[PDB]
Structure 1
């Protein structure tokens, strides 16, 4: 049905190996860079997280049975709610491992400025909102980085896997198949040329005999 020609195809399939092997060489160290730096961000992430998780909650959990009627008061003095449509600051960024968007969680929420209410807890709960915001930026960058480094990792293992099967020995067997048929064609050459020789000698053998 669809079968490869020998003479036309030859020159394409020899440069096929040149093109492939070199391309894949550098393709290799292309993602390697990006994963080495990625360890750096995942580790560093949680640094702020242990520190500020606990000092947020410090006041929160100590303002639940002194709240549920001082809930009103606390929300009043403080800076009103973050917008539900893009209260966060979304950033777009094109990078290898496809176009993945990032973002940083910084918005207003105030701190140490609610008037009236519980002496200590009110103000301490308001201040705590910062320790959500700030802390959240770390996870804001690593969970979006996670989706980028997903793309790379998967495409990487894909190409290796694929290459060692369909591609590489296939781009081989093409030269081989070609070769062998070019070669074998030249049996008929020699056989014909043989019989040609036989004629020639047979002709000069009628001058001197029969």
Structure 2
């Protein structure tokens, strides 16, 4: 049905590998570099973050100081000098490793909106929020790189595998099948020819003899 033509195509299917085999190999370790390289950013990512999380935690906890109780007050009493929420300005990083959104939510998180320095803990503490926002970005943006870096590798190998693990030997066995038949044809010829010789020789036995 759908198998060979049976013939001469052999050469193309010989060339199958030329295309396949040679290209596809190499593709693997290309990006391997980038994933390797990813890690520097990952390492650095949380570095300051965790540090300055605890130096966040200062202010959080210094809420409770004389303003645990005025947390209640504060949550109104300080809240709105700035847009709360969004300003997420979606960013492309466009590479092999496609494009996904990253972003800087580049709107401020603010902190001054009140006078005197008002209740006090407030201002410096509100200032801590900066050091949430800003800092969170590092990781926000390194992990989106991560997701890129997952994909490739995974996807990659999926084909690696495929090539290695179906393609090549399948097409091998084709050629052979072909070959062999073609080849065996030689014989038939010969088989015929043999008899032909037999004829020529029979003629030559009983036309020279008789």
TM-score (norm 1): 0.86
* 1:131 positional shift: 0.6
- More moved, 36-45 vs 120-129: 120-129
Q: Deviations over 1:183-210 (max 9, x none)?
A: 1122211101111111111112223213
Structure 2: segments with no counterpart, 5+ residues: none
Q: Distance in 1 between matches of 2:4 and 2:86?
A: 57
Number of corresponding residues: 210
Verify the 8 A CA contact 1:79 1:109 in the aligned structure 2. no
* 1:78 positional shift: 5.9
Q: Distance in 2 between matches of 1:80 and 1:44?
A: 33
* 1:125 positional shift: 1.1
Verify the 8 A CA contact 1:59 1:124 in the aligned structure 2. yes
With over 3 angstroms needed to count, the CA separation of the structure-2 counterparts of 1:150 and 1:81, relative to structure 1, is farther
SS of the counterpart of 1:97? Answer: coil
- More moved, 126-135 vs 86-95: 86-95
SS of the counterpart of 1:89? Answer: strand
- More moved, 109-118 vs 26-35: 109-118
Q: Deviations over 1:56-77 (max 9, x none)?
A: 2211122147446534765678
With over 3 angstroms needed to count, the CA separation of the structure-2 counterparts of 1:171 and 1:81, relative to structure 1, is farther
With over 3 angstroms needed to count, the CA separation of the structure-2 counterparts of 1:82 and 1:89, relative to structure 1, is farther
Q: Distance in 2 between matches of 1:140 and 1:82?
A: 22
- More moved, 140-149 vs 96-105: 96-105
Once the two structures are superposed, the pairs formed by residues 67-146 of structure 1 within 5 Å of their partners are 67=67, 70-71=70-71, 74=74, 80=80, 86-111=86-111, 114-116=114-116, 120-146=120-146
Q: Distance in 1 between matches of 2:71 and 2:115?
A: 13
TM-score (norm 2): 0.86
Q: Distance in 2 between matches of 1:82 and 1:191?
A: 96
Q: Distance in 2 between matches of 1:68 and 1:77?
A: 13
Q: Deviations over 1:66-111 (max 9, x none)?
A: 4465347656786737657742221023322332221124431234
Q: Distance in 1 between matches of 2:158 and 2:173?
A: 22
Q: Distance in 1 between matches of 2:108 and 2:15?
A: 61
